[PDB]
Amino acid sequence: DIYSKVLVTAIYLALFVVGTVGNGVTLFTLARKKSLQSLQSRVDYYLGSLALSDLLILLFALPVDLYNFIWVHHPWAFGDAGCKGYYFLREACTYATALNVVSLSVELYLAICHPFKAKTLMSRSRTKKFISAIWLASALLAIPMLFTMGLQNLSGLVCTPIVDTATLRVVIQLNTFMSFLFPMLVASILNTVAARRLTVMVHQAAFNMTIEPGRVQALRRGVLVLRAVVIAFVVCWLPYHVRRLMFVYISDEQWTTALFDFYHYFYMLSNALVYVSAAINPILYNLAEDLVEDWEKARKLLEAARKGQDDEVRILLANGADVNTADETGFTPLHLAAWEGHLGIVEVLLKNGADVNANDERGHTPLHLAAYTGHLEIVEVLLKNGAGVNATDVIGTAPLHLAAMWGHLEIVEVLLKNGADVNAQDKFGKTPFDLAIDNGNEDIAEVLQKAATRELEVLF
Numbered sequence: 001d002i003y004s005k006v007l008v009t010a011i012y013l014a015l016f017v018v019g020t021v022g023n024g025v026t027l028f029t030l031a032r033k034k035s036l037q038s039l040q041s042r043v044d045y046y047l048g049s050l051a052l053s054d055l056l057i058l059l060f061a062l063p064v065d066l067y068n069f070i071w072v073h074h075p076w077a078f079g080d081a082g083c084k085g086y087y088f089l090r091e092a093c094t095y096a097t098a099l100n101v102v103s104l105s106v107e108l109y110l111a112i113c114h115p116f117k118a119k120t121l122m123s124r125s126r127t128k129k130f131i132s133a134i135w136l137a138s139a140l141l142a143i144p145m146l147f148t149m150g151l152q153n154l155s156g157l158v159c160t161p162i163v164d165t166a167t168l169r170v171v172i173q174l175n176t177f178m179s180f181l182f183p184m185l186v187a188s189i190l191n192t193v194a195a196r197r198l199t200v201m202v203h204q205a206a207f208n209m210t211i212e213p214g215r216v217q218a219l220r221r222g223v224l225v226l227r228a229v230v231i232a233f234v235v236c237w238l239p240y241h242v243r244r245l246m247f248v249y250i251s252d253e254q255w256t257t258a259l260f261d262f263y264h265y266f267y268m269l270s271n272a273l274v275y276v277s278a279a280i281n282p283i284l285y286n287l288a289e290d291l292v293e294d295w296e297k298a299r300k301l302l303e304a305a306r307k308g309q310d311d312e313v314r315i316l317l318a319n320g321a322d323v324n325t326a327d328e329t330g331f332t333p334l335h336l337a338a339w340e341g342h343l344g345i346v347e348v349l350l351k352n353g354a355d356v357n358a359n360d361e362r363g364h365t366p367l368h369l370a371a372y373t374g375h376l377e378i379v380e381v382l383l384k385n386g387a388g389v390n391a392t393d394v395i396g397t398a399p400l401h402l403a404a405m406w407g408h409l410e411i412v413e414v415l416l417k418n419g420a421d422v423n424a425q426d427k428f429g430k431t432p433f434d435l436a437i438d439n440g441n442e443d444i445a446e447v448l449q450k451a452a453t454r455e456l457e458v459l460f
């Protein structure tokens with residue numbers, strides 16, 4: 001069938017031109033990147049390793065494959081070296097890709113399931129040496145293909161196995177388990193266990209009120225990406241490995257003209273999907289970078305708001321940084337801004353739709369911190385943006401309690417004006433008036449007492 005090959009040629013060229021350029025750009029980008037952050041650099045090395053392996057598959061394996069294996073009528077044009085080299089390089093890359101793919105699964109698992117251990121015990125230098133081992137291990141396990149494959153004349157020349165069927169069955173079965181089955185088994189398990197561990201963390205993190213930490217939200221996106229990579233790897237590589245197992249077992253005697261025509265379709269289809277796996281690789285890079293960038297932007301926003309770098313804050317929000325980013329303890333940037341007393345940074349965030357009634361672990365809102373600080377302008381600002389006046393923490397402490405306790409008469413007058421419940425008291429039973437007396441802020445006590453008595457007059 002002439003048409004079949006013409007259709008395959010078009011698809012191969014399509015995967016070749018964009019896949020080669022696609023992965024080429026990824027390497028060029030990473031090489032010049034000069035990333036300062038550890039997480040960025042750590043991931044980039046793996047993406048580069050995947051970019052390199054998948055580029056080599058498209059640059060060298062595909063052209064040889066297309067000319068001598070798809071268009072079979074051509075005699076072998078690459079000589080004995082080209083035959084042995086083709087299968088060696090092809091085998092080395094399959095391994096490398098599979099090992100890199102599962103290497104992402106252990107790194108995600110470690111990050112999710114051993115956060116304390118991983119954070120401390122992960123360095124850039126550790127990753128470089130680890131990846132070096134993968135390529136070496138792959139190259140070592142690829143060497144056999146230099147000895148198992150060679151040129152035989154059936155007068156034309158064909159790049160065919162030169163060893164006996166028994167020896168051939170072993171090496172490929174070894175390669176199948178080592179470079180696919182084992183990796184994809186581990187990849188699936190580690191992902192599934194990490195996915196379950198993550199789900200607990202999300203439920204543990206978010207309760208009555210704690211929002212959701214940005215770092216968890218990053219890992220929650222992480223599993224979803226690798227979930228796609230494993231499902232993507234299996235559908236693309238299973239047919240290839242299954243075809244190779246068919247070839248070794250379906251050896252001699254039964255090799256009819258008809259059986260080959262069938263196997264040739266399998267060969268076109270199975271290899272096309274391998275080149276698809278190489279061609280979609282740059283999407284994983286884009287998705288990985290998009291995620292890692294969003295995480296860094298969010299970290300920067302929390303750092304900037306605390307530091308009081310108003311210029312930085314604006315820059316980040318302009319480039320779609322998450323306004324409502326909780327830290328480890330559930331602190332939004334508005335908390336940190338209001339805490340440190342950056343009226344400008346507070347105004348900017350609220351303008352970009354910052355959650356005015358966000359809660360931390362202790363249940364503190366931004367207003368609680370502004371009342372503690374005593375910054376009247378921010379308190380006024382927050383209340384204008386619809387901040388809850390009678391919001392209470394775990395202990396039952398409210399803004400009025402904090403203000404009165406620490407002696408901010410202007411804040412106390414402001415809070416009462418916005419419908420603050422003077423009567424409301426904490427778990428210990430103390431009202432603001434009781435706390436004001438306890439601290440001895442007599443000027444404030446008089447201000448509160450009059451309000452309570454006014455409420456009694458209003459009742460009759």
Ligand SMILES: CC(C)C[C@H](NC(=O)c1cn(S(=O)(=O)c2cccc3cccnc23)c2ccccc12)C(=O)O
Pocket residue numbers: 068069070072087158159160172244247248255260264267
């Ligand atoms: C198990 C692997 C180490 C070898 C396998 N190669 C083959 O199955 C092929 C081996 N040849 S061939 O050039 O040796 C060949 C050429 C022509 C007729 C053949 C009949 C039976 C077996 N091979 C024949 C192919 C021709 C077209 C498509 C595929 C092949 C592969 O590349 O995956």
